[PDB]
């Protein structure tokens, strides 16, 4: 259906994942255990885990400015 769809690939990079190591989902996106970025500086982090959100994502850098406690 729709167009020729290629393979799940993560966000801020488009590698081919799939296994639960590689492949990470988040708010509806998908990335990598070392992909995550901020919106905003970009900055990536290991973890594969940080302050995402739904559309948009941040480390716990520009996070940490705005000061979220938990
Ligand atoms: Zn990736
Ligand atoms: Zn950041």
């Given at each position: 259906?729709?167009?020729?769809?290629?393979?799940?690939?993560?966000?801020?990079?488009?590698?081919?994942?799939?296994?639960?190591?590689?492949?990470?989902?988040?708010?509806?996106?998908?990335?990598?255990?070392?992909?995550?970025?901020?919106?905003?500086?970009?900055?990536?982090?290991?973890?594969?885990?940080?302050?995402?959100?739904?559309?948009?994502?941040?480390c716990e850098?520009?996070?940490?400015?705005?000061?979220?406690?938990?």
């Amino acid at each position: 259906m729709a167009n020729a769809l290629a393979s799940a690939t993560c966000e801020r990079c488009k590698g081919g994942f799939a296994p639960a190591e590689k492949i990470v989902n988040s708010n509806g996106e998908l990335y990598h255990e070392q992909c995550f970025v901020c919106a905003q500086c970009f900055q990536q982090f290991p973890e594969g885990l940080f302050y995402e959100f739904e559309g948009r994502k941040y480390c716990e850098h520009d996070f940490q400015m705005l000061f979220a406690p938990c």
